[PDB]
């Protein structure tokens, strides 16, 4: 056997965190078009038999809170876990509506000892956010 | 006994330290390319091969436009970080 067992009762979860509107105090601009991404993703993963859950405009606390609760669920009848994060960000950090959350923190909720029901199962994190401020000038 | 960081896959929209492009009406370059490829190949290719297709799509078909010379005509290349232990197929 050299491929992940995908024959479990259900394909798995698919949490999509779509952040468009941020708090004035943060100084972060609205992410126009992100709804199209949230909508597109919802359909695709739906057609892949995943249990999609859309969460819009979550605060840094609500993000951790959600990830904490999702890890405490029973995934024994699930094949995988997909987590999509659409938001602003920097290297190792994604923005909640009121402040930054370091990826490492929410990622830990699913690593081995924390989420035993997903052990040996693929935990996929798809991330649409900036990772710095460099610009690629292309060539040819 | 396996590593605690094993079986993780981070599909980033852009390379380390770079900006990531999004379009006001079309959505983000990465996501729209991601979904396109999934629809067409989720039942033919292994995940890593699908993501590679996305890399090519985003890197080839997309280039930015702005009135600000600094942010004009810029490119993007997604980044795949895999710590998966096996191959992944959606069937």
């Amino acid at each position: 056997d050299n491929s992940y067992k995908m024959d479990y009762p259900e394909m798995g979860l698919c949490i999509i965190i779509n952040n468009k509107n941020f708090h004035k105090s943060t100084g972060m601009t609205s992410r126009s078009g992100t709804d199209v991404d949230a909508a597109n993703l919802r359909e695709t993963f739906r057609n892949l038999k995943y249990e999609v859950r859309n969460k819009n405009d979550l605060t840094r606390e609500e993000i951790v809170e959600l990830m904490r609760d999702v890890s405490k669920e029973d995934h024994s009848k699930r094949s995988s876990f997909v987590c999509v994060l659409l938001s602003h960000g920097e290297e190792g950090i994604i923005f909640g509506t009121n402040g930054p959350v370091d990826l490492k923190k929410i990622t830990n909720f699913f690593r081995g000892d924390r989420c035993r029901s997903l052990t040996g199962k693929p935990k996929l994190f798809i991330i649409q956010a900036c990772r710095g401020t460099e610009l690629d000038c292309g060539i040819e | 006994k396996i590593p605690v960081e094993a079986d993780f896959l981070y599909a980033y929209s852009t390379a380390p330290g770079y900006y990531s492009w999004r379009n006001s009406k079309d959505g983000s370059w990465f996501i729209q390319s991601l979904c396109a490829m999934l629809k067409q190949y989720a039942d033919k290719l292994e995940f890593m091969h699908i993501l590679t297709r996305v890399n090519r799509k985003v890197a080839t078909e997309f280039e930015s436009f702005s009135f600000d010379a600094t942010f004009h005509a810029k490119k993007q290349i997604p980044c795949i970080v895999s710590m998966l232990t096996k191959e992944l197929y959606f069937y």
């Binding site: 601009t29 078009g33 960000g89 649409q128 956010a129 | 929209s13 492009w21 379009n23 006001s24 942010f71």
Partner: peptide, 4 residues
């Protein structure tokens, strides 16, 4: 086009 906008950045994230």
């Amino acid at each position: 086009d906008e950045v994230x």
